[PDB]
């Protein structure tokens, strides 16, 4: 199954049929290259990885020469060094003198390999000189300066293969080849800010971080991404009080090197409309105030309203830390009221599936497991919008294999190919009985994705009844070695909120609250909170939700605090704090820990390690960071989630709606940024975006 060869005297064994550059990477031998990438197709454009191979007359390209047995490879031949100096000089004679103005100064692949392998001096000194390429306006997110392009096809290969946006290409012969849309067509996709980390030269670069900073100045910090379902890995670059950019570090399970558009360009709204001090409402006007003023106003209004029980609502929101939910849940339950709800519509009740048995609300196959799939179906979701990295996974596995898709819900424009089934629960049950009982029962590794948008529907339990009966009846979708019922969760908090038990009881959904606590919780409507109620909004920047409050309290956002976050798969991951909270904002659990002291509650923790001990008391899979466990309770959980809504909910004929109205402005940071604000208008249906 493996092949043993020799590079640089080193003897190496590698799986059969691989590329030669993978054998050089396995043996530790450093080979320079410009048009090779791990997540992309092989092209032999840049001619940089030439290598001396015995039984070959010419130096062969190491990226596309397949591995054969008995192979003797040398990389330190004088001919190979001459070849690298030659090809490097050839690259540099039409590449413009833009290094003081290029955005990739200390980051340029062309530049660091020109010291190490290229020629000292340059002989390019014609009077006619270099060519010049016209600038090409693509979109508002990507600055495009194509004189300094080397035609590595890497952006084109990517937007063809993985992003599913075929608008990029290469039109021309000779030097008059260009890389852009031919018509000056605007490029959309849900991850278009990923082509600008991909280009090795700075021809495709960042537009809001156009000329702001510079990589030897930046301090890098490895954190976790909120405002995403999957909770992808990032890399925060900070000047020290400001945050410059996020940029994906690799993890083959959660994001596979590729990160959302909305995750990337929301650093603009991190710093534009923030809360830096507490504000107390006087009546039609806020005033800002002292801490003792705000927190004692909270204590005095508690003593004035006196909610004795089931009247202190505490609803959390889209992005929160797990530890702030520990703080809030402990404060409300030592208060004596589990009116402890989540933000979404139909968040006032238990969400039609069990807080019991973690496999009820989690993505139960691994995110690595979707690569192994045969025929999968989704209900009520658009995975192109929500968890846009999962769309890259689905299209990638659909491209490599024989995969079969249909969809139940709104007519989605996928990158990949869906089949349509309908817009009705009756269309659902008809499609489960008619065609896809046979398909999902036939298939080895199928799965079923359930959107959390239909969890927020009031007719939720009919869908969960039908799908639980189908998963329990079919032994292929649910067996020992893998699990096939799967759900997606829109926000990064909802999986952690369901781990901790942050959900209301049946008694708590009946009463109207006298005092409401918004921790985050931006998508509340005006009608959701009572008019007599004393609401307080703890959150990091001003929003819809801050406008309704009688007191606001600034908190640290996800950059400014170290935090546990739980994704759809169930991974607990820590964000490292890059900068500190500006002005007067504090961390989110410390504020609740201090507001408790002015009430009758002394929370048993007071330090950061005791929060971790209390968090291990809630569940010890939240101190066990970045591990995934299986579930032995997969059989019992589907039955226990079948028994509940059996006959309790009748399926109404309301059509299945789209979960999010736009992609770009869905939480408190993305709605504050001007980048999403001028992005959503430019990524609305125009003639520049119509394929025609």
């Amino acid at each position: 199954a493996e092949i043993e060869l020799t590079i640089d005297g080193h003897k190496v064994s590698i799986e059969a049929g691989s590329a030669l550059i993978q054998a050089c990477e396995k043996a530790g031998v450093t080979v320079p290259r410009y048009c090779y990438h791990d997540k992309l197709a092989i092209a032999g454009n840049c001619r940089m990885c030439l290598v001396d191979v015995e039984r070959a007359p010419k130096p062969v390209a190491s990226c596309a020469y397949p591995v054969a047995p008995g192979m003797v490879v040398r990389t330190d031949t004088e001919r190979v060094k001459q070849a690298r100096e030659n090809v490097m000089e050839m690259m540099l004679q039409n590449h413009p003198l833009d290094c003081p103005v290029c955005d990739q100064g200390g980051e340029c692949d062309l530049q660091d390999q020109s010291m190490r392998y290229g020629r000292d001096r340059g002989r390019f000194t014609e009077i006619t000189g270099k060519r010049s390429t016209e600038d090409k306006n693509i979109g508002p997110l990507v600055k495009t300066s194509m004189n300094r392009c080397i035609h590595c096809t890497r952006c084109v290969r990517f937007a063809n293969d993985i992003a599913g946006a075929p608008e990029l290409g290469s039109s021309g012969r000779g030097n008059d080849m260009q890389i852009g849309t031919y018509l000056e067509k605007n490029l959309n996709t849900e991850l278009s800010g990923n082509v600008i980390d991909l280009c090795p030269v700075g021809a495709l670069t960042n537009k809001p971080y156009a000329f702001r900073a510079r990589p030897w100045e930046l301090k890098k910090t490895e954190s976790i991404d909120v405002m995403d379902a999957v909770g992808s890995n990032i890399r925060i670059d900070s000047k020290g009080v400001e945050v410059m950019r996020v940029i994906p570090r690799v993890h083959e399970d959660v994001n596979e090197e590729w990160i959302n558009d909305k995750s990337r360009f929301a650093c603009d709204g991190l710093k534009t409309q923030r809360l830096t001090t507490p504000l107390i409402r006087v009546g039609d006007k806020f005033v800002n105030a002292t801490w003792d003023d705000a927190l004692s106003t909270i204590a005095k209004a508690y003593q004035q309203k006196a909610p004795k029980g089931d009247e202190f609502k505490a609803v959390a929101g889209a992005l929160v830390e797990v530890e702030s939910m520990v703080a809030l849940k402990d404060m409300t339950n030592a208060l004596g009221s589990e009116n402890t709800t989540t933000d979404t519509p139909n968040g006032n009740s238990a969400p039609a599936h069990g807080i019991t048995f973690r496999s009820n609300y989690l993505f139960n196959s691994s995110i690595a497991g979707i690569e192994d799939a045969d025929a999968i179906l989704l209900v009520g979701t658009n995975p192109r919008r929500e968890a846009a990295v999962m769309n890259a996974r689905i299209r990638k596995a659909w491209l490599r294999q024989e995969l079969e898709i249909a969809s139940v819900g709104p007519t989605l424009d996928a990158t990949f190919d869906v089949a349509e089934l309908g817009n009705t629960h009756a269309d659902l049950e008809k499609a489960l009985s008619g065609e896809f009982g046979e398909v999902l029962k036939n298939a080895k590794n199928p799965l079923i994705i359930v959107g959390s948008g239909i969890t927020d529907r009031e007719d939720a339990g009919a869908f969960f009844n039908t799908i639980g009966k189908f998963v329990e009846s079919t032994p292929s979708v649910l067996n020992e070695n893998w699990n096939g019922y799967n759900v997606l969760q829109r926000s990064a908090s909802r999986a952690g909120a369901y781990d901790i038990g942050f959900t209301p009881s049946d008694e708590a959904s009946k009463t109207t609250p006298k005092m409401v606590w918004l921790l985050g919780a931006d998508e509340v409507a005006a009608s959701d909170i009572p008019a007599d109620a004393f609401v307080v909004y703890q959150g990091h920047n001003g929003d819809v939700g801050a406008q309704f409050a009688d007191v606001v309290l600034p908190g640290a956002a996800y950059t400014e605090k170290a935090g546990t976050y739980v994704n759809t798969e169930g991974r607990s991951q820590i964000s490292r704090a890059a900068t500190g909270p500006p002005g007067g904002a504090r961390e989110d659990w410390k504020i609740l820990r201090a507001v408790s002291e002015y009430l009758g509650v002394a929370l048993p923790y007071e330090d950061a390690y005791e929060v971790r001990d209390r968090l291990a008391e809630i569940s010890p899979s939240l101190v066990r960071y970045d591990l995934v466990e299986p579930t032995v309770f997969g059989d019992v959980a589907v039955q226990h989630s079948l028994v509940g809504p059996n006959g309790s909910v009748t399926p109404s004929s309301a059509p299945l709606t789209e979960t999010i109205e736009n992609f770009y402005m869905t939480d408190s940071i993305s709605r504050s940024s001007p980048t999403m604000a001028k992005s959503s208008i430019a990524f609305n249906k125009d003639n520049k975006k119509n394929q025609a």
């Binding site: 003198l97 833009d98 003081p100 103005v101 010049s132 390429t133 004189n147």
Partner: protein, 117 residues
């Protein structure tokens, strides 16, 4: 004239010193910090001091807009930024500008606009 110094107290500076420069009234960057914000932030130390002997050196965004636009017959317009009375290498590195789109394309070092004709 009268700007509020964080207390309701009006402070009064002449109108020739609220300009960013005597070329240009307004700001040329999204974080340029207009002069009224500057005198609002630390007027504690503009006390007893002459405003006229402060520098105020001729904003350059307006001195480049009034330069004419060069016209090039060919496709590519090549640029030094150099003087040719000076014995040496002055100016910026040579860059080559494509003039094909409608309008006039600027040099990214010097800002001199070039147009194809």
């Amino acid at each position: 004239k009268s700007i509020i110094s964080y207390n309701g107290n009006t402070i009064e500076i002449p109108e020739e010193y609220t300009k960013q420069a005597p070329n240009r009234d307004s700001t040329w960057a999204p974080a340029q910090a207009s002069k009224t914000e500057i005198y609002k932030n630390n007027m504690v130390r503009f006390e007893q001091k002459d405003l006229s002997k402060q520098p105020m050196p001729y904003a350059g965004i307006e001195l480049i807009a009034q330069q004419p636009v060069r016209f090039v017959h060919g496709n590519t317009a090549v640029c030094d930024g150099a003087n040719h009375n000076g014995p040496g290498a002055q100016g910026h590195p040579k860059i080559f500008i494509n003039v094909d789109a409608p309008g006039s394309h600027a040099c990214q070092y010097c800002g001199t606009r070039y147009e194809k004709e």
